[model samples]
Target chain A: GLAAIEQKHAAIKQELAAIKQELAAIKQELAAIKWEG
Target chain B: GLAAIEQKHAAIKQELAAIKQELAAIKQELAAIKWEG
Candidate 1:
């Protein structure tokens, strides 16, 4: 079954990490806009 | 419970306004860092 995807869940970890990186980039963009305004 | 995740659903509040203010402190820290390699 796909229980392995739930139990092992490396994909979820990767997704969380990717989200974290994107969060960092988004944080950067917000900063630039704020300083400019 | 679903209530926990529901309560932590911050985007409902945080994403609704002033996102730049949210990242200001982190941006200040990054600015202080030596980004040049």
Candidate 2:
């Protein structure tokens, strides 16, 4: 089942990549908002 | 600094949203993988 797990891992990586893109967009929005964080 | 914290909190919320979506997708992918866990 190593192949199965690896397949799932690849999908997880894709999801993670998509999330990273989303997070990047959010960060850009936050930068524009400009708070004392 | 309440307003400042609140502003930062909103940004944090956005980040959390992205994380939540990512986790949900990951869980779905996990289900498809079919492991004993």
Candidate 3:
């Protein structure tokens, strides 16, 4: 979520958590792509 | 329908598995990426 690096990798892990939600949205997009495919 | 990885996931567990095999090609594109942080 943060643009810059932090001292602890906790922020990195948090960003990964955000990525999963983004991935889920991407997954939802996959459903739509199928309808067109 | 045949990336053929071993698993106990009731199907590939593709979040929405029924949609998965239906769009196997699209699913493969998604699966190919690793979510490295």
Candidate 4:
């Protein structure tokens, strides 16, 4: 039980970190767009 | 029961669709930059 819970916890942490990275990338790309043109 | 899993599945599907839209927007913006000087 302990190891199973640990596995799921680590997996979710990794997934959340990946999601954060993607969101940051999206934000950065959106900032590069020119709205005045 | 079945309803709880269905709710979670729908939520994730909506999130994934939103992410897809963001990625599409990023690509479109990147394409615009390429056409500039």
Candidate 5:
């Protein structure tokens, strides 16, 4: 089951890494929004 | 002032909550895609 757990961990990490990308994009948008307003 | 900062904190909290939910979903059933073997 350890392999299964690691695989699960990998899945979460992949999603998380992708989530970070979106978060970074949002951060950029937030900065733009804040400065333009 | 603290008012604007508080709003920003809550904004991050809201986004973080959604992110947490997404991670939780992955835990429930890990999905597939690119990763080193």
Candidate 6:
């Protein structure tokens, strides 16, 4: 059970990290438009 | 075990929905700017 729990935790961690990057990229794109205008 | 399978899927779907809300708010916040120029 310990291994199963750890596996789920790791998967959740990785997913959140990837999602964070996606959000960061999105933020930059939005930032780009509102600049130098 | 089968219940756990559904649980993970539901968890992920909920997370995405929450993320979508966060993204929409950001879009509107940016939309507030770069307008009426």
Docking class of 6: incorrect
Per-residue alpha-carbon lDDT of model 1 for B1-37, expressed as tens digits?
Answer: 4344444444543443344454565656655552531
User: By lDDT, highest first, what's the ranking?
Assistant: 6, 4, 2, 5, 1, 3
The per-model lDDT (C-alpha) reads 0.53, 0.58, 0.48, 0.64, 0.56, 0.73
Q: Which model, 2 or 3, shows the larger DockQ?
A: 2
| Model 5: number of backbone collisions | 0
- Model 2 chain B poorest ten-residue lDDT run: B28-37
**Candidate 4: misplaced stretches above 4 Å?**
A1-17, A29-37
Q: What would the per-residue lDDT of candidate 1 be over residues A1-37, giving only the tens digit for each residue?
A: 3454343345445545665675788677667766865
**Top candidate (TM-score):** 4
**Lowest-lDDT window of 10 residues in candidate 3 chain B?**
B1-10
Query: Model 5: per-residue lDDT, tens digit, A1-37?
Result: 4555555456656766878886576566556556755
List ranges where model 1 is wrong by over 4 Å. Answer: A1-8, B1-37
lDDT of 5 at B25: 63
Q: After best superposition, candidate 6 residue B1: deviation in angstroms?
A: 1.5
Q: What does candidate 6's lDDT look like per residue over A1-37, in tens digits? A: 4346557656785887698689888878767766745
What's the true lDDT of residue B5 in model 5?
Answer: 48
- Candidate 1 chain B lowest-lDDT run of ten: B9-18
- Candidate 5 lDDT by residue in tens digits, B1-37: 4344455346555666688786556534322311211
Model 6 segments more than 4 A misplaced: A1-9, A17-37
True contacts reproduced, candidate 2: 0.06
| All candidates: DockQ | 0.05, 0.04, 0.03, 0.13, 0.05, 0.23
Fraction of the reference Cα-Cα interface contacts (below 8 Å) that each candidate reproduces: 0.00, 0.06, 0.00, 0.06, 0.06, 0.11
Error of 6 at B8 (Å): 0.8
The regions of model 2 sitting more than 4 angstroms off are A35-37, B1-18, B22-37
Q: Which ranges in model 3 have alpha carbons more than 4 Å from their true place?
A: A1-7, B1-37
Instruction: Show the lowest summed lDDT stretch of 10 residues, model 5 chain B.
Output: B28-37
Higher-scoring candidate on lDDT, 1 or 4: 4
| Tens digits of per-residue lDDT for model 4, B1-37 | 3555455456556666776787787777778778873
Chain A TM-scores for all candidates read 0.74, 0.73, 0.58, 0.69, 0.73, 0.73
